[PDB]
Design a protein around this ligand. Sequence first.
Ligand SMILES: [Zn+2]
Ligand SMILES: [Zn+2]
Ligand SMILES: [Zn+2]
Lengths: 266, 65, 134, 114, 46
Amino acid sequence: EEGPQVKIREASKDNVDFILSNVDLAMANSLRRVMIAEIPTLAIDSVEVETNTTVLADEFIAHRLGLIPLQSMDIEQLEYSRDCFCEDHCDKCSVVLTLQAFGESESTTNVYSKDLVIVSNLMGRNIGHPIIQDKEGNGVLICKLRKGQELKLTCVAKKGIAKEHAKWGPAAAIEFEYDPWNKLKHTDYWYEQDSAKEWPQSKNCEYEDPPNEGDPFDYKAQADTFYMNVESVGSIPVDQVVVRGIDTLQKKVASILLALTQMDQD
Amino acid sequence: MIVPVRCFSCGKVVGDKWESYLNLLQEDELDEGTALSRLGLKRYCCRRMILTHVDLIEKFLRYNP
Amino acid sequence: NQEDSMIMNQSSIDRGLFRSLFFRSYMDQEKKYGMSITETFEKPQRTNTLRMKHGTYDKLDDDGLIAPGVRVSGEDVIIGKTTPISSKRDASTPLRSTENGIVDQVLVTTNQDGLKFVKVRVRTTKIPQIGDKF
Amino acid sequence: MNAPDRFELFLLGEGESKLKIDPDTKAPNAVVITFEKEDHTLGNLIRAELLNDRKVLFAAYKVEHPFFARFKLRIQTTEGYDPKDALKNACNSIINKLGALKTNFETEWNLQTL
Amino acid sequence: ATLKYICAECSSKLSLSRTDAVRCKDCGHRILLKARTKRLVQFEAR
Ligand SMILES: [Zn+2]
Ligand SMILES: [Zn+2]
Ligand SMILES: [Zn+2]
């Protein structure tokens, strides 16, 4: 506690509602971006198809498989497959999954992502577990099957980021508001009569103070205080998103510093 | 054609949700309104991802081989 | 987004918004009226005529057709056949000069006139790229 | 079909550098550093903070074209004080603010329930 | 394993040779589809 000042008011396993005090807007922002965009994760990224007698085409399922939430908790200790010295993949860069199910009954047989199965060695790290929030206990819903239709796949989950494909995003929807009344007049509100009767008072209007008619416009003021909230898909628990956010922002700030050091050389 | 995973616009997973939706309307008798809300679907891009999707798969299944 | 254009969310696309499947059908037959000249399906090569297509034939098996699993693009021959004239002139059909994708189904039948007759299908997924009319 | 592979967003190509630094001809004591494989998430921060430093006269950035992942930052400073330093002090000043946030958040998060 | 064709309506693992033309086996319909390959195809998962 010496600068930037957080304070949570509501927090769950997928919601961190907090004020963020004492900061440059330009930062708060760059935080939310790098959140959405640049925090590493694991998600299926190569499907080898054995047999597929589904009403759904190959490349379709492949795509669907992409999006499935897979555990990335320990992810920051798995290697980028572009980096790893193996030809294609290994357990040092990738988790491999298997899916088969097969029409068995008359009644429509579902293929949940609970029917997903690790194959490769996790070497005891916490990775590649299809994530289920479902009460009933069934992750997502891949596909469906009539009486006699196999489906034989082989998922190779690889490290990656949102900037490459929104499957690798961990984040979902990020709430973001500053200065609930327009004290900074950063906006000019549209209207037909009363600006106030016509727009709505943001829930964030109790933790700030009303303006008081008499006062003239405060000018040299700037942006403190940003009323945020972080939802999570849940490859990563909410806290680690924001943490790793602050982290990756720092890491890629940090690498410029290194790059300037590398150029005094020649 | 199979409930999409994750709404195009927000990101939040919406696959795991189709089933429960069906149930909360036609079983213990609610209106699609309150039902969309029990599921935790507040933001309406991710509200429209379910209320609109049409489950055609049900119909290709029908075709025999 | 100026003069009747629009900017779209790259993100939402990867997430699936506005994707299509594009199946296309090619089609073929064996001559018809002939008592000394009849067409034939086979993965050809030389044999006196040497008028063969620019592309790769190797995607074909023995019956003259591609298998379903296989990926195709460029001038990939997709159905080969010979018109033996007095020995065997080529008449096979390349996948479109601009196209690319995965074989889906392959139909093998006869026509009323006893004809050997074929219908190879090809599939792409076409993702909403930049200038596509909306 | 003409589309340019995703990773060309964060991966460097060949013979390219994470920075190239070049001297502005217009002014004195002024420079324009290029930033390969970057964008706003980074430039907008560098800049705004490079503006809390009172020995800096000028500081601006611009994504020349959203097709490519570049972004050019141009800085001008007081007599003496080489720009690199400017860029340096600010680069750091941010890490420190960030580090604090990390810990400050880490403190609160621990106090809550659920 | 070594299969060449399949008729459309029921799904019989037929595999007859040239100088046989067409037709199923106790199901008739001269339709027929070409099975699949075993070069088991790789997918961009995007
Ligand atoms: Zn490897
Ligand atoms: Zn949404
Ligand atoms: Zn039959």
